[PDB]
Every structure is written in structure tokens, then in C-alpha cells.
């Protein structure tokens, strides 16, 4: 969710400098989102390997 990415529901920009700050804010949000997705994929691969071992 937006609160999990460092953003807020009211997050926006009204001046060009605010957009210039929002550039780096969206940078940080996209980076943390990619890290969480990679961790979820590693957990899925671990679940598949444990499934084969249980079988």
C-alpha cells in the first residue's frame, strides 16, 4: 500500500520544486517495492523446494 511505500493518499505536488522532490520520493518507493517483490519471490521458491522435500 502507499503507506508501505513511504507515500500517502494525499501525496502530490503543487510547485515544480515539489515535483523535483517527488522524483526522488518515487525513486525510493519504486526501489523498496522491487525489494519486497524479490523477497516474496525467494519465499515462493523456498516453499516449492520444501514441497518437493515433503513429498
Amino acid at each position: 500500500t502507499l503507506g508501505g511505500l513511504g507515500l500517502t493518499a494525499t501525496s502530490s505536488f503543487t510547485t515544480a520544486a515539489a515535483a523535483k522532490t517527488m522524483i526522488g520520493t518515487i525513486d525510493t518507493a519504486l526501489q523498496t517495492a522491487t525489494n519486497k517483490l524479490a523477497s516474496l519471490g525467494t519465499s515462493s521458491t523456498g516453499l516449492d523446494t520444501h514441497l518437493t522435500f515433503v513429498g
Binding site: 523535483k20 522524483i23 526522488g24 525513486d27
Partner: protein
């Protein structure tokens, strides 16, 4: 006085030609602003271009 009248005519034609120099409401030669920032990289680096008043 004929030449001074033609002088004033070309003079305020300069004012018209300078006032009309704008693109989508923004002008670099009108003198309404000191400088125009521009994108230079994906991170938002500026490409400063100093305004030159005409």
C-alpha cells in the same frame, strides 16, 4: 520631424516584436523571467539556460 516619426514607429514596432516572442505562453526573450531550467537526466538534473532580454 518625418524621420523622427519613422524612428518612433520602428521603436514601438520593437516593443510589439519583443512582446509577441513567446511559445505556449513561455518566453526566453521577453524578460518575464531570469532563467529556464530544463531536464538533463532521469534524476531531474537541471539544464540552466540564462534568459536574454530583447
Amino acid at each position: 520631424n518625418a524621420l523622427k516619426s519613422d524612428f518612433d514607429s520602428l521603436r514601438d514596432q520593437i516593443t510589439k516584436a519583443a512582446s509577441n516572442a513567446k511559445f505556449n505562453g513561455v518566453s526566453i526573450a521577453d524578460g518575464t523571467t531570469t532563467k529556464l531550467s530544463f531536464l538533463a537526466n532521469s534524476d531531474g538534473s537541471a539544464f540552466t539556460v540564462t534568459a536574454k532580454t530583447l
